[PDB]
C-alpha cells in the first residue's frame, strides 16, 4: 500500500475543512472532506442517471441519454422525466468537479507544493460551466445545453455548429484550434526531447540539459529551455480551453447569424470594398 519513499510524507495537516476528521487515506487514495463530498455527489449523480435510463427504457450505454428541458421551460424547473433529472445531475456533476479541485488543494498543502494543478483544472470546469450554465442562462433556456449521452452529445455538437453554417468560421474557434494543435506539437517535442537525452544512442552516457538546448538551437535557432517548456505547455493548454469557452459564449448571444457572414466586415472596408477583381469583386 505505500511507495518505498512515502511514509515520511504522510503527516497530519493541510486540510481546509474538518481538522483531522477525514485526514486519512484508503489504499493509495487521500480522502479529506472533499473526497467524501466528491463520493456523495458522484454516487447521487450515477443513481439519477440509472433512474433516467429506466424512464427511457434502455440499459444500453450507447443509447442512454439524459436531456435538458425543452426550450419552452425557459430557465424554470422542469418535471423529472422531461429535463428535471438533467438539472439535478448537472448540480451533482458541478459539485463533484469542484470537490475534486478542492481535494487537490488539500493534497498540495500536505505536500508543500504549488497550487498550479487545481488552478489548471479550474479551466476545464469553466469550459463545462460555459456549456451547461453560462451560455444557456444568457440565451434564456436550459434547453440550449448539451445532453448527457455518448452519441447524443456529438449530435448536439453537430446540430449546434450547423445552426451557424460552417462553425470553422467562428474566429475565436480558429484561435482555440490553433492552441490545441500547437499544444500537441509542443507535447510531442517535450516528451521526445527528454527521452532522447535520457536514452541516447546505445552505449553512450546520458545527455545533459546542455545537449537539449543545443539540439533545439541547431534545429531551429532557439531553445526555450527546461523551465520555459513547462510554462509554455501550461499556457498553451489553458489558452486552448479559454478560447474554446469564449468561442461558445459569444455564439447565440452577441452573434447568431452565419459565422461565414461575419467576415464581411473585412471585405467591406471602404478603402477596398468597391475595388474590382479578386474573389469578392
Amino acid at each position: 500500500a505505500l511507495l518505498s519513499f512515502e511514509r515520511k510524507y504522510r503527516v497530519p495537516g493541510g486540510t481546509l475543512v474538518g481538522g483531522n476528521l477525514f485526514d486519512f487515506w484508503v489504499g493509495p487514495f487521500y480522502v479529506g472532506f472533499f473526497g467524501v463530498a466528491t463520493f456523495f455527489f458522484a454516487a447521487l449523480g450515477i443513481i439519477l442517471i440509472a433512474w433516467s435510463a429506466v424512464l427511457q427504457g434502455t440499459w444500453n450505454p450507447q443509447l442512454i441519454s439524459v436531456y435538458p428541458p425543452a426550450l419552452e421551460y425557459g430557465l424554470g424547473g422542469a418535471p423529472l422525466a422531461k429535463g428535471g433529472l438533467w438539472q439535478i445531475i448537472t448540480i451533482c456533476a458541478t459539485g463533484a468537479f469542484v470537490s475534486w479541485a478542492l481535494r487537490e488543494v488539500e493534497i498540495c498543502r500536505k505536500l508543500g507544493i504549488g497550487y498550479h494543478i487545481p488552478f489548471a483544472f479550474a479551466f476545464a470546469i469553466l469550459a463545462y460551466l460555459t456549456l451547461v450554465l453560462f451560455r444557456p442562462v444568457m440565451m434564456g433556456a436550459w434547453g440550449y445545453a448539451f445532453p448527457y449521452g455518448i452519441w447524443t452529445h456529438l449530435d448536439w455538437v453537430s446540430n449546434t455548429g450547423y445552426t451557424y453554417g460552417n462553425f470553422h468560421y467562428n474566429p475565436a474557434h480558429m484561435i482555440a484550434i490553433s492552441f490545441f494543435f500547437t499544444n500537441a506539437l509542443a507535447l510531442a517535442l517535450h516528451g521526445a526531447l527528454v527521452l532522447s537525452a535520457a536514452n541516447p544512442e546505445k552505449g553512450k552516457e546520458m545527455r545533459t540539459p546542455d545537449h537539449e538546448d543545443t539540439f533545439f538551437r541547431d534545429l531551429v535557432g532557439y531553445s526555450i529551455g527546461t523551465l520555459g517548456i513547462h510554462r509554455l505547455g501550461l499556457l498553451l493548454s489553458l489558452s486552448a480551453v479559454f478560447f474554446s469557452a469564449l468561442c461558445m459564449i459569444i455564439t447565440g448571444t452577441i452573434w447568431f447569424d452565419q459565422w461565414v457572414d461575419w467576415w464581411q466586415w473585412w471585405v467591406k472596408l471602404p478603402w477596398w470594398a468597391n475595388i474590382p477583381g479578386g474573389i469578392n469583386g
Binding site: 500500500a1 515520511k8 486519512f24 487515506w25 489504499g27 546542455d210 523551465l227
Partner: protein
C-alpha cells in the same frame, strides 16, 4: 471488413502500449510496502519491469532501476492509529527532522554538473561575465520573513551557468553566516525580498552548505525541503 480489422488491431496495440507505460512508471518506489517497511502482500496487477541501466556522464557511474530501495536516513514519525491509513505524527521538530512537507531525499552529496563537467550552479561572484540583465537586482536588499521582521540581506545570486538562470539567493544573517534561499520561494520587491514560507527566527535553521562556492544535490534537497516546510510549520508565526 478491413476497417473492422483496423480498429480491433488498434485496440490490441493500445492495450499493449498501456501495459508498457504502466510498468515503465513503476521503476521508482516499488515494491510497495506496509507502513512498517515490510513488503506489501498486494503489489497490484502489473509485475515489476526488467531493470534498465543508465550510464551517467563524467565518470559518475551507473544507475539501475528498479533496484534496492532504501530511505538511507532516520524518519522521526510515529503512528497515530492502530490500523493502516492514518497520518504519522512527527516525534520531534518536523522542520529539523526533515519530515512532512519539510522532507528531503538522500540524493548524492555531489554537485550537479553541466555538459562540460563543471559545476552547474555557482555564486555569481565566481561566474565570469554573469550579471543581472533585467528586473530588480536583489543584491543588497534586506530580506523579510512572514513575521514581517528583517532576517538578513542578499549578498549574492547563485546562477545556473548552462541555463542562464537565477536559482538561489545567498542571504547573510545577523551572525555573519549565510544561507541559500530558493528563488521560487521569494518575492523580489523594489525595496526588499519577502519570504512568505519562513519567519525571521527560522532562517538560522536553514541547512548550511559545506563549501562556500558549490552546492551539492543533497544540500539543495535539504534546503528546499526545509523552506517549503515552513508553509505548514511556520504557520503559527505568519500574520498578514
Amino acid at each position: 471488413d478491413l476497417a473492422s480489422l483496423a480498429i480491433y488491431s488498434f485496440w490490441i496495440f493500445l492495450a499493449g502500449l498501456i501495459y508498457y507505460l504502466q510498468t515503465e512508471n513503476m521503476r521508482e518506489g516499488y515494491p510497495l510496502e506496509n507502513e512498517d517497511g515490510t513488503p506489501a502482500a498486494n503489489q497490484g496487477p502489473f509485475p515489476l519491469p526488467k531493470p534498465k541501466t543508465f550510464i551517467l556522464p563524467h565518470g559518475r557511474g551507473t544507475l539501475t532501476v528498479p533496484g534496492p530501495e532504501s530511505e538511507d536516513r532516520p524518519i522521526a514519525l510515529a503512528r497515530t492509529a492502530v490500523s493502516e491509513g492514518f497520518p504519522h505524527a512527527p516525534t520531534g521538530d518536523p522542520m529539523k527532522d526533515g519530515v512532512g512537507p519539510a522532507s528531503w531525499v538522500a540524493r548524492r552529496d555531489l554537485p550537479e554538473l553541466d555538459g562540460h563537467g563543471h559545476n552547474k550552479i555557482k555564486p555569481m561572484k565566481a561566474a565570469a561575465g554573469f550579471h543581472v540583465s533585467a528586473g530588480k537586482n536583489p543584491i543588497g536588499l534586506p530580506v523579510r520573513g512572514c513575521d514581517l521582521e528583517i532576517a538578513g540581506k542578499v549578498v549574492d545570486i547563485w546562477v545556473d551557468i548552462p541555463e542562464q538562470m537565477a536559482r538561489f539567493l545567498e542571504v547573510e544573517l545577523k551572525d555573519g553566516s549565510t544561507r541559500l534561499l530558493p528563488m521560487q520561494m521569494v518575492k523580489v520587491q523594489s525595496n526588499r525580498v519577502h519570504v512568505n514560507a519562513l519567519s525571521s527566527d527560522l532562517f538560522a535553521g536553514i541547512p548550511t552548505i559545506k563549501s562556500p562556492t558549490e552546492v551539492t544535490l543533497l544540500e539543495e534537497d535539504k534546503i528546499c525541503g526545509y523552506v517549503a516546510g515552513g508553509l505548514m510549520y511556520a504557520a503559527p508565526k505568519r500574520k498578514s
